Structure 1
Amino acid sequence: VQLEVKERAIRPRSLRNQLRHEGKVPAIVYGYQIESTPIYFEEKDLSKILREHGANTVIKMTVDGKNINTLMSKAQLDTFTGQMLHVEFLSVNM
């Protein structure tokens, strides 16, 4: 429901490989309110919402302002790893 929001910065050049070894998820959200705020996550934050409350259900990306509802869309997952990249969101209302 209430994931942990870490609002990122504008230019990630080759700093990014530090987050791939730390198991981090930089999270696109383009939708109704937000045009782009990439957001940190830990890779063990999402699977216990997908396999707990549903694989496509309501996930709220809120910082206790307005209440947002997301529709996790796509991901490339590279070979030989099986780990998480390219996590896009989609903020659709009630």
Structure 2
Amino acid sequence: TANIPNKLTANVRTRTGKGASRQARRDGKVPAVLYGHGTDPQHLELNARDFAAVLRSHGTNAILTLDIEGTEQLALTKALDVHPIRRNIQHADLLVVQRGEKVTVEVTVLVEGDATPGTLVTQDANTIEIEAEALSIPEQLTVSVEGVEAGTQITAGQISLPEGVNLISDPELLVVNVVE
């Protein structure tokens, strides 16, 4: 299973600095830095609307193709500086990738189901760090809580890993705690 690397335009940044960044964010753009094994970082201006659409529709760890002045460069979303209050994306650190890279990311774990009525489920891990090729990063990693009594420490090694993915976290990592 693969993921269609979402398309985006990426104008390069002419003036770099906090003034230029703020003017861009007022213009609706997003400052980003594309780096990786490219080893010659590019400073870019994405569009906030479509970038946020990509992120909220394909999670954070999303592959994406960047029309960088005609060239279509493949990249990953490595990190995001989002404001706490506004919750607007302030900056995007993007990772150059290619076919068969086996990148490492921090994917969204998602609990689902419902246990016995006489218990409660507490998520200790928002996410799980994994190794996988950069065209099959899951949007989510699901886990089930149907028919699990109290005292069932669901850890990270007990997860249903897809094909190709490889845990880099430890199996001791507690993910969900089922309690009274």
Q: Is the 8 A contact 2:81 2:91 kept in 1?
A: yes
User: Following the alignment from structure 1 to structure 2, what is the Cα–Cα distance between the partners of residues 28 and 49?
Assistant: 17
Aligned match for 2:90, one of 68, 81, 85: 85
Tell me the TM-score normalized by structure 2.
0.44
Name the structure 2 match of 1:19. Answer: 24
Change in Cα spacing, 1:85 to 1:91, as seen in structure 2 (3 Å) is: same
The one-letter amino acid paired with 1:25 is V
- In the alignment, which of 40, 44, 51 is matched to residue 35 of structure 1? 40
Conserved? CA contact 2:24–2:45, under 8 Å: no
How many residues are matched?
A: 92
Residue 42 of structure 1 aligns with an amino acid whose one-letter code is N
TM-score, reference length from structure 1: 0.75
* Structure 1 gap segments, 5+ residues each: none
Q: Give the whole-Å Cα distance in 2 for the aligned partners of 1:80 and 1:50.
A: 19
Contact 1:71/1:91 (<8 A) preserved: yes
TM-fit CA distance, 1:32: 2.6
Give percent identity, aligned residues only: 21
d(CA) in 2 for partners of 1:80 and 1:57?
24
Larger Rg: 2
Distance 1:15 1:35 in 2: 21
| CA gap 1:48/1:16 in 2 versus in 1, 3 angstroms | closer
> CA 1:10–1:47 in 2, change beyond 3 Å: closer, same or farther?
closer
Gaps of 5+ in 2: 1-5, 100-180
Alpha carbons 1:68, 1:93 under 8 Å: kept: no
